[PDB]
């Protein structure tokens, strides 16, 4: 979060174009699909997170 | 078919016993479905499939929320059924969502 | 025929594609049961009414059985 954030705020800063603009948005989306858990490939990853979050709700009981 | 020889069918179906054994769960479904046999509703088969799209969108099951507009393309290609509105609302009813994994179409 | 052999295709391809339907949507009815509530709906159906049916029919062969 923070390190795409930064990405996003520099690139706005620095910019005079707005097509450009939509270059520091767009890029910051696309760190965050990548790092995190998301895309298509990470789906594996995530099915056994999902197993985790379970153990976590099962010491609720 | 007629309906009521029909209505004995589903209740062999859901139930394990046959007719012959109980009356009452039989009583009951010809009871209700005699009554209310018209739709209360009316017919949106378009709202139904958004309804399945919003669901599979749900489950994060974006390549079978494609997939159903191609099933429910077909259903609509043969038409061999009078309302396709009915059943969709029927399986949709029923739904469940673990809110987890994806499935594959199995060719 | 070969045109009435033409139907009984268009028929049997419909009875499979709603039963990729039924295992999309995670419910418990089965291909044996489908074929019947697709019946009752080629008449017309309340399928508010159908639906409750199957939800007092489910609750007399779990709850005595």
Known sequence: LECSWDELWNKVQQAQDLDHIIAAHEVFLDTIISRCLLDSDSRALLNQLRAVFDQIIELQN | ?107 | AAAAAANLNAVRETMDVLLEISRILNTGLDMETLSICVRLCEQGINPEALSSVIKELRKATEALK
């Open chain 2, 1 to 107: 078919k007629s309906p009521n020889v029909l209505l004995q069918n589903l209740c062999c179906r859901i139930l394990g016993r046959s007719e012959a054994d109980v009356a009452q769960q039989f009583q009951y479904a010809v009871r209700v479905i005699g009554s209310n046999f018209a739709p209360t509703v009316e017919r949106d088969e378009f709202l139904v499939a958004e309804k399945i799209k919003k669901e599979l969108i749900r489950q994060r099951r974006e390549a079978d929320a494609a997939l159903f507009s191609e099933l429910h393309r077909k259903l609509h290609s043969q038409g061999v059924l009078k309302n396709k509105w009915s059943i969709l609302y029927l399986l949709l009813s029923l739904s469940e969502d673990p809110r987890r994994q994806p499935s594959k179409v199995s060719s």
